[PDB]
Amino acid sequence: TQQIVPFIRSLLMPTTGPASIPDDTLEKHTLRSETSTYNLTVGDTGSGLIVFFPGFPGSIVGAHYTLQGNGNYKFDQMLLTAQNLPASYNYCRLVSRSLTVRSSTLPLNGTINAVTFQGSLSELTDVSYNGLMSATANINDKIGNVLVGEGVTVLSLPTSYDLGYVRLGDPIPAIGLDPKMVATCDSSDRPRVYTITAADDYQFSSQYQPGGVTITLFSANIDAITSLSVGGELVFRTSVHGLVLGATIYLIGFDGTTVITRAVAANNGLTTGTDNLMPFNLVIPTNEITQPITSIKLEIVTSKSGGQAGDQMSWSARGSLAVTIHGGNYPGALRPVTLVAYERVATGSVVTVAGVSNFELIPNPELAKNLVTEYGRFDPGAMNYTKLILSERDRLGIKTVWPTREYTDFREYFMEVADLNSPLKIAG
Amino acid sequence: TQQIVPFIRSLLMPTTGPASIPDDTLEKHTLRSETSTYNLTVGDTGSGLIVFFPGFPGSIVGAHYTLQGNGNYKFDQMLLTAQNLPASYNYCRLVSRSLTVRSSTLPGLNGTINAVTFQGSLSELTDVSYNGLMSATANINDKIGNVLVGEGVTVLSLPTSYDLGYVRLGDPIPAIGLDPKMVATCDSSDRPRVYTITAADDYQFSSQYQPGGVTITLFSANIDAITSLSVGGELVFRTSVHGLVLGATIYLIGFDGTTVITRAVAANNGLTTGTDNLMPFNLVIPTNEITQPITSIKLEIVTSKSGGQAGDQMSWSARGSLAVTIHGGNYPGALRPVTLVAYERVATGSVVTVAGVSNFELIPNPELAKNLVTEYGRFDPGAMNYTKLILSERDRLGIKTVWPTREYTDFREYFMEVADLNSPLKIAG
Amino acid sequence: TQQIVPFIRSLLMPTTGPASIPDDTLEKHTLRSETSTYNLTVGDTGSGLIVFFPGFPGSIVGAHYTLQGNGNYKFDQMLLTAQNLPASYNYCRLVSRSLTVRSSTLPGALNGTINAVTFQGSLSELTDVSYNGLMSATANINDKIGNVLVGEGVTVLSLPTSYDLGYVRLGDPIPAIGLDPKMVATCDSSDRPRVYTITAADDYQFSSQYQPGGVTITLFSANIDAITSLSVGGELVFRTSVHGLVLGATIYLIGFDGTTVITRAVAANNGLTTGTDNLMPFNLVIPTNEITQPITSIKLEIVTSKSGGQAGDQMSWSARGSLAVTIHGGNYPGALRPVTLVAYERVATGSVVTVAGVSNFELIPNPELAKNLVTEYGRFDPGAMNYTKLILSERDRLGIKTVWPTREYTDFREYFMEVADLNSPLKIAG
Amino acid sequence: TQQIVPFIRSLLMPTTGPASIPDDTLEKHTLRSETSTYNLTVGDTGSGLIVFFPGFPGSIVGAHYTLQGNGNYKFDQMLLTAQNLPASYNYCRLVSRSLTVRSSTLPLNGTINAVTFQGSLSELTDVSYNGLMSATANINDKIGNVLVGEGVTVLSLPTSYDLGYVRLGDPIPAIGLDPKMVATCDSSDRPRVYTITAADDYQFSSQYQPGGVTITLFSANIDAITSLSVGGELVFRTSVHGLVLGATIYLIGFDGTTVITRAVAANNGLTTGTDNLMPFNLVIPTNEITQPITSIKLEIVTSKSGGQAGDQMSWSARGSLAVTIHGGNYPGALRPVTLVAYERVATGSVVTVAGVSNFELIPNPELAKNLVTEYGRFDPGAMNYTKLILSERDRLGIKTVWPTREYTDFREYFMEVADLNSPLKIAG
Ligand SMILES: [Ca+2]
């Protein structure tokens, strides 16, 4: 520390403002802060979960779920940046981010457990208040039973530097006959791909039914916050004449709710002694994803034209599908997740979220006319200092989740120099 | 500056030759320069536009458009590297590049130049007129106005990110096939760009019967492509009317409004009542089909009926989104920064001369690799820090992406004041 | 060199253990070593080829092929890491790797030599893979070694092809339930895909007389590379003047040994209508587990038959379209790219060619292991990367090879690594 | 640089005058400069090509070709030294050379592309204005789209030192009955040899023709500016009686034009069941070569004494030829070539060439009576300095082809000491 190092200051105290990442990604950019402010209402059980995406390169900060009588979560709302970055910028990179979670009202209130998990949302094996505590072995990535009144601070720590600029989901110039037409340029670099072999000569056998017989061929945990696509093909064989197949893909939210439902093939006759192809050509736009996607499943309906008492409908199925979630493997886009769980909070009280997110940004064409961009400030040793700090993360006690009181202490313990500027004022 | 720093020299004075980028991308490579030389002819209006892709990792340097009586641009030709890199190399990275635009011959001084570097791809520019260019950036060192054509302009490529991966060039891959016109390449793929177009969300179509059908343009959207791309996704059609037949075509439109590529996506396609009718998109567009930069995509649909009469009212509902993936499209330099050089008031028939040097890190193809030694880059510490410092002070140093050539020449000699032979190595021991 | 530099030590002497790569990719990770041990049996010809993927970010180390009487190679087995990384970890980055190849046992035989090269391309890109032909795959003298005695053996050392690489997703199983026992769901290496584009036809005219059973053609064949999952997309469009033509089409993915690895019917029994486009879409996804050996080429066959049929019937169609073969994470440096070939010949039939290696990784544990596996940011030492850059910059004058006569590598180890100095007065400090 | 180094000065600024090459070739010699001055006229297409032989040890500097409507070149003239060195000197060595090409009149004018190619003229795969640019990979051996008004400077850079003295094509004392008798002593050291196996049991078969049937047995690219010879033998076998063979060798110029035509065997009966020899004993003197030779071809005429409708004439041929071009492999004699191409220059305008060539020379016997010769000035470190400079050629930007403006700048940037001579004038 001398004066200090703008980047370290920004990284460890994001509410302080942005600084350019001192890596090798030399783009002309501009630096911005976006606040997040939410007043969430506590449900009947007095318990709930905030899912944060600490590294998300853009306006999505997290999602809030209330816990219900029956032990299920129920989606409340997305937690966003104050304004929608893709409306003004085309490219983006996360510099630093911190969020504060505490109670503000009562109609004192319970406790908080928090973890930073090194995987995407659907990968967590246990998301209960208590179960959170073992999502990492890292002591500085979990905090237990912090009083809600005092609150918790979530600090975003890096998962890789020299990251590319991410395209935001920015609207692209387009005209179309449909009012509800939407055209964007999506986060794409570093896609995540899931491959699901749904069937390898899977035999299906069942008696006839008016209305048909529905099965769930598979269900698989995947993650998506933004646009994705499904490709691939199932091949069906049969000895039985006049079978008609229906198939639907469901994308399921964290709360078990159907987020998206897409008929992949409806009313589709099967021919005897031939391959019957069922292609998958799904594109799911960002705006359709009303809450984080947590799993994908495929249902198949089998029915017969004629039909009787005992008819026995049978088919064989083979094939694999590929689920590409665009930009999904970009560190921060899905990957690190910070869960903040609260319980025993009085029903009707307010859980207050306040955060600052800092970005390197490239303006969209209209803003670029009035927004000057520059290469980052050069200070050598900024990156080495960051590397040193992170290297000593555990001995320094630099947490991703803090009791706010402890984070406040840390701020003043660190940051003991901010020294005006000695004789520039008297120099010459 | 001590002696100097090969990379800085190469970056600021590309005509000087190549140097390895001093980042962390440690590959065994070889360093090469490729010249670009063009003598472009000025059209009737005395006005035109050169689109440069200053950061393009490969042989595509830009494109020339003439401006026409009716105010439209008309494509002239691609501006390329002297030789086709993908014929000899498989992987590539741009080190540095500069280009010069000026007039040489006058027919039996000519006008002015405006230039900008725009931080987006070609189709993203809101205004591409000679005058309108000047506001594409707010950055004073990324625009230059009313430079005399005789003196000319210098385009200097400034970085948009280091630690970039090697890009696969569009290199031919060994292949045999029954078709003479068969082409197999391995394309720039890393860092794709993806556009998502929701063309319809229960869009109702309604119209009276027509012999030959009724054609509509469902959507049109600005996209960018110079190299291979693909279109995926699906539209779903519903209808109450029997015997409707659908035709659908995708058009990829050039900067000059011209159709570059036209692909029937579904021709003659009967719609069944009370069911989803699927129209999949499985398009792959190879690089060699893209004769000029793609600027927009549109989809037309033809609706016709088997029978047909006077008043028949054909109706359908449509739902679905498409995804346009342009391979390696988000790789910084591949589409992103664009430098426009516009000229006007140049006498018709005069020559606008382009001369450039492009510098590359390259990996040879298998046949060349047998005779082309590759190495890790020369190590000099502080090269990257010095680059970072220079760029950090870009504006106070006045390091432009577009220069009046005279000012760039001055800068060269102002900078580069040491190139000092090599003092007593010659007398050492 | 002072003490030394853990990373350089790991890079140049991988059997020594792992160290964090001193680049800018700051992830909380853990460091691990995985051994590779194989005892390969020499075939009838006394000759064979080991294909190594020195930079592979994961458990695939290489593949062994024996050479046969007829001059063809025949796949033996994949060479892997001791345990399957994707079963325990989700993300991975290669730190360093070295492998040893030597004779250990013989029947009865005093012959046997190794030629080896590191080729800066993927397997299918090599123009000549014969024992002798290897020697010209690079011009780099420190990337080839010739006629090393098999008894002494060869050392393959993995040298970097780029730092600041992203973590690669391993082919890790993803939680899934399904009606099929043989159901498999993974999250694959995807970042940095490789894409091949094949224009299979541009108004290609087909013409042939009728045949019971049909007339099969190979429309195209193209060299591609795949070790892990890939997909095929695109479309062919067929036109015809002849009524009642039925088309069959199959894609074959062919192994290095000319053997069919994967065969997928793309369209079987498919009637063509007169005066219209007839679409043949490609919607293929090939999962990793189906790829039993490295894929070296792709070909498409088309069968043309007619419902009726007679003596002279002349079946004709026109075809247009291109396909795209995406191999997931294929362009990630190391995934396909550098290949080291170790060829042996004149080894006595029935003798053992022994492979021993160590691979070092930066790893992120899967959710179950993450509960008990502490992860950290890498040890900071400044000048580690500069020192690496210096070393590599002077690679040729230092004689740092990717393929060594083992005896020469051993000498190099002791020539380098002349300081490992205990730790002077910490023991007496205060 | 101290004062400077005469040789480096001469090498980098040839217009400055000659200096002795500081190698080990210690001959008593004399130093001379010869200018080259040409005013070339631009043809109909406004386009043309100047071929320079930058290293030529003697009076041949280059050749000018105009480009024609049909895309062919047409030879204009040889570009020579001001006076014919072989008339006055017997031996010679090139020290340094520079030439300038620019427009001097109009009847504003076009552009120049230039390259130095490390091979002889006929070896260039592409000689078009645009194609030139890829003849080398060396950035300092090519220059693109230089304005003709400003012009280009060609600088000759070494291709080997410790070269022998070359015999010029000097006239030798001789008397003869023929007025047109010419006797010279030619550049011979380091011959270049081409070997052409024209036939290895090549079967010829064709129907009879009054006047015969002519074939071109082979055509091969070779290079010659000065004297050459053709040796070797073809052997013909046949089953057919009364066949008569004619054979002619053509040496073809760069412009596709026949430079030299020599009947090798005219009217030559073939005997059945025997080898029929056709020897090659050609000597081509320098003075017959009116423009650079670019290829050699051999035509054979086959005719029959009798002759009818269908007669079928057949022969088998075997043998190889050797083309020796005297002194051809002497570095500079054929080897490096610098091409200066211009286009878009107005028809009728003058392209002006001005150059200086510097030589080490040994006078002919008559001049030797009045021309003092000496061993070169000794300065140690001259050669090391040259080696250093050339070793750093690319970082110093020492080009073989320059935009003249850039070369002029270089001259004044270099050559910053030429310091009179401080107190010799005041010494003692
Ligand atoms: Ca870096």
UniProtKB/Swiss-Prot annotation, chain B:
Transmembrane segments: none annotated. Signal peptide: none annotated. It comes from the Viruses. It is found in: Virion; Host cytoplasm. A divalent metal cation binds at D23. Homotrimer. A central divalent metal stabilizes the VP2 trimer. Interacts with host ITGA4/ITGB1. This is Capsid protein VP2. It comes from Avian infectious bursal disease virus (IBDV).
